């Protein structure tokens, strides 16, 4: 029971997109006021300085302390 897989990049569902919704809109990707959460700690990013990972999003806390590849 789905309409379309184009809208919020979180709940695999379309966004209201009617005329002034409290949703998150990015350069290309998008999310909801709730769905919009880190990809490591799933923390509330709505209204914050979230980051942009390769193919995912993250929060300043995580992005700042990203384990990264095999390094020190």
> Interface with Zn ion by CB under 5 A: which residues?
8, 10-11, 32, 35, 38, 40-41, 43, 59, 62
**Are the beta carbons of 26 and 32 closer than 8 angstroms?**
no
Cα–Cα–Cα angle for 25, 60, 33, rounded to 5 degrees: 30
The minimum distance between CB 9 and Zn ion, in angstroms, equals 8
The minimum distance between CB 30 and Zn ion, in angstroms, equals 9
Judged by beta carbon, residue 49 or residue 69, the one nearer Zn ion is 49
**Are the beta carbons of 45 and 38 closer than 8 angstroms?**
yes
Q: Is 13 helix (H, G, I), strand (E, B) or coil?
A: strand
The minimum distance between CB 1 and Zn ion, in angstroms, equals 16
Judged by beta carbon, residue 43 or residue 46, the one nearer Zn ion is 43
């Amino acid at each position: 029971g789905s309409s379309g897989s184009s809208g919020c990049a979180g709940c695999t569902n379309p966004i209201s997109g009617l005329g002034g919704t409290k949703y998150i809109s990015f350069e290309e990707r998008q999310w909801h006021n709730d769905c919009f959460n880190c990809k490591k700690c799933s923390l509330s990013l709505v209204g914050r300085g979230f980051l942009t990972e390769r193919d995912d999003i993250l929060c300043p806390d995580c992005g700042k302390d990203i384990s990264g590849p095999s390094s020190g």
